[PDB]
């Protein structure tokens, strides 16, 4: 067990690397989700506006 625990500290920096990588991956996943959501909002917003313009021109006609 001396061996096991001596090298647990030797591979603790690798543990930190693994941790940070996983956390960053999850954070980027959430960022992607939020990016998609904002883009969806923009797509929808444009449909709403385009209609309110087909109806605006319809009023003119």
From Swiss-Prot:
Localisation: Endoplasmic reticulum membrane; Endoplasmic reticulum-Golgi intermediate compartment membrane; Cell membrane; Cell projection, Lamellipodium membrane
Residue stretches in coiled coil: 30-59
Tissue occurrence: Expressed in numerous tissues. In normal brain, expressed exclusively in neurons, not in astrocytes. In Alzheimer disease brains, expressed in about half of the activated astrocytes located around classical senile plaques. In Parkinson disease substantia nigra, not detected in melanin-containing neurons nor in activated astrocytes. Expressed in erythrocytes (at protein level). Expressed in myoblasts (at protein level).
Listed result of changing residue 49 to P: In DHS1; gives rise to mechanically activated currents that inactivate more slowly than wild-type currents
Superkingdom, taxonomy of origin: Eukaryota
Reported function: Pore-forming subunit of the mechanosensitive non-specific cation Piezo channel required for rapidly adapting mechanically activated (MA) currents and has a key role in sensing touch and tactile pain. Piezo channels are homotrimeric three-blade propeller-shaped structures that utilize a cap-motion and plug-and-latch mechanism to gate their ion-conducting pathways. Generates currents characterized by a linear current-voltage relationship that are sensitive to ruthenium red and gadolinium. Conductance to monovalent alkali ions is highest for K(+), intermediate for Na(+) and lowest for Li(+).
Misc. comment: Piezo comes from the Greek 'piesi' meaning pressure.
Assembly description: Homotrimer; the homotrimer forms a propeller-shaped Piezo channel with a cation-ion conducting pore. Heterotrimeric interaction may occur between PIEZO1 and PIEZO2. Interacts with PKD2. Interacts with STOML3. Interacts with TMC1, TMC2, PCDH15 and CIB2; the interaction may be part of the MET complex. Interacts with MDFIC (via C-terminus); the interaction prolongs Piezo channel inactivation. Interacts with MDFI (via C-terminus); the interaction prolongs Piezo channel inactivation.
Family statement drawn from the similarity comment of this UniProt entry: Belongs to the PIEZO (TC 1.A.75) family.
Known disease link: Dehydrated hereditary stomatocytosis 1 with or without pseudohyperkalemia and/or perinatal edema: An autosomal dominant hemolytic anemia characterized by primary erythrocyte dehydration. DHS erythrocytes exhibit decreased total cation and potassium content that are not accompanied by a proportional net gain of sodium and water. DHS patients typically exhibit mild to moderate compensated hemolytic anemia, with an increased erythrocyte mean corpuscular hemoglobin concentration and a decreased osmotic fragility, both of which reflect cellular dehydration. Lymphatic malformation 6: A form of primary lymphedema, a disease characterized by swelling of body parts due to developmental anomalies and functional defects of the lymphatic system. Patients with lymphedema may suffer from recurrent local infections. LMPHM6 is an autosomal recessive, severe form manifesting as generalized lymphatic dysplasia.
Protein's recorded name: Piezo-type mechanosensitive ion channel component 1
Species name: Homo sapiens
Interval of the full protein contained in this chain: 1310 to 1370 of 2521
């Amino acid at each position: 067990v001396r061996a096991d625990l001596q090298a647990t500290a030797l591979l603790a920096s690798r543990g930190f690397a693994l941790y940070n990588a996983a956390n960053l991956k999850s954070i980027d996943f959430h960022r992607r989700i939020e990016e998609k959501s904002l883009a969806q909002l923009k797509r929808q917003m444009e449909r709403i506006r385009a209609k309110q313009e087909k109806h605006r021109q319809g009023r003119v006609d």
